[PDB]
Symmetry: C2
Subunit: 252 residues, 2 copies
């Protein structure tokens, strides 16, 4: 059993840590699309093309299942991936939803996710057909225009309330689609008050239990299509140690 996880950046090294602790002996191969990283703005057809390519990379790496930890690719490319890669494919939306639907009490739940996944409607849908009033809202893309340091103090506690306006006191469960400053977990869980935030990474990992045979050499291989700046440093902080990465289409 070899698990292939694929993401645009390093946010997927989270799921990967969950998997790996639960499935202690499975072999893993990660592939981050760092060379194209600002995914959540690209078209549906772009997201499906970049996804096809990265999945094929891992397929050809001999994996058994392909976990796609990105909400944007999971929201647009799962049909296509499945249909072109002769293996099981798992995204992070459906486990998030199942969980949300479970955790909830009043079934008035919300989703904060990238503009491109929030546009897809995949979350909204899957939640409604499960019997639940979805309150969605998109991630604010701030760093390009202004430095987050601008959004510190006063102005931050006002971005929040205006964004998480409707959500106000109507929801009781939330899928943190994708968190960007100033909408950190603790800036929102403060405005909204102690709400049940779905852990999309623990939910996902768990969700692969019946398809995964906990077996393998316990190996780990990390790949990225661009040896970006502080990649290596980030890897160190998230995983706990330093794992050597290779470049996608290097030795091969």
């Amino acid at each position: 059993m070899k698990i292939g996880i694929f993401d645009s950046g390093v946010g997927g090294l989270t799921v990967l840590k969950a998997i790996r602790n639960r499935y202690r002996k499975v072999d893993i191969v990660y592939l981050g699309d760092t060379a194209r990283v600002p995914y959540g703005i690209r078209s549906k057809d772009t997201i499906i093309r970049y996804s096809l390519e990265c999945a094929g990379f891992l397929k050809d790496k001999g994996v058994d299942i392909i976990v796609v930890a990105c909400n944007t690719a999971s929201a647009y490319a799962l049909e296509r991936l499945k249909k072109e890669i002769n293996v099981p494919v798992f995204g992070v939306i459906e486990p998030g939803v199942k969980e949300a639907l479970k955790k909830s009490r009043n079934k008035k739940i919300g989703v904060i996710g990238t503009p491109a996944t929030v546009k897809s409607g995949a979350y909204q849908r899957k939640l409604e057909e499960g019997g639940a009033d979805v309150f969605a809202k998109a991630c604010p893309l701030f760093a390009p225009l202004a430095e987050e340091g601008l959004l510190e103090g006063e102005i931050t506690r006002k971005v929040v309330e205006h964004y998480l306006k409707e959500f106000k006191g109507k929801i009781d469960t939330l899928i943190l689609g994708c968190t960007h400053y100033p909408l950190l977990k603790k800036e929102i869980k403060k405005f909204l008050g102690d709400a049940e935030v779905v852990d999309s990474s623990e939910a996902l990992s768990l969700s692969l239990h019946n398809f995964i045979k906990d077996d393998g050499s316990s190996s780990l291989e990390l790949f990225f299509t661009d040896l970006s700046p502080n990649l290596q440093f980030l890897i160190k902080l998230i995983l706990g140690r330093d794992y050597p990465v290779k470049l996608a289409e290097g030795v091969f």
Copy 2:
């Protein structure tokens, strides 16, 4: 007297507010380069070309002085601007330095700024020739690869200490060149302890006092080369109300 302030994004609407409160009757024309916004990565010659163009835009808008609030353009394009625009040009580095040099006690001061301005050496230099041990370090470019929400808790308090490592307990004054998550003002002023952070915007504004004749119709015009997403919303939050913006090279 008409003041032309120019920046890459909205971070300059800060200086603009300082100016405007101090110089209550001067007329103003702001120009943000939103269409090209990720400035701090481009080349010296690129920064000088984009700067030339935006300054010329304002010159042709009939301004008397041109304030450039971006550290990256101030660090590479002031010679060129002055030499091509027949008017007084003021950047945000030299007032920051004067202030730093003043505020300091032990003259062991630091600068956290974008990789491109920190490379320029303009801060380091100007501080050394003023008799001071500069501790510089670059802004970590994180949002592209991973979402800041990843950098929340544990991992954030560890990014800081490793970056503001050397600075540790050696500095007593700091020029917050440019603040990006997780290096917010309050994450650093916590690691480092209560240090004297230079207010580069109050310093700058103040620095124009002898060149500015507080006179004019008290007008305000906001221009940007790309009516980017939440531009309009950000403007609202920083300035206090909504100011109509126009597009650079619109009616003209």
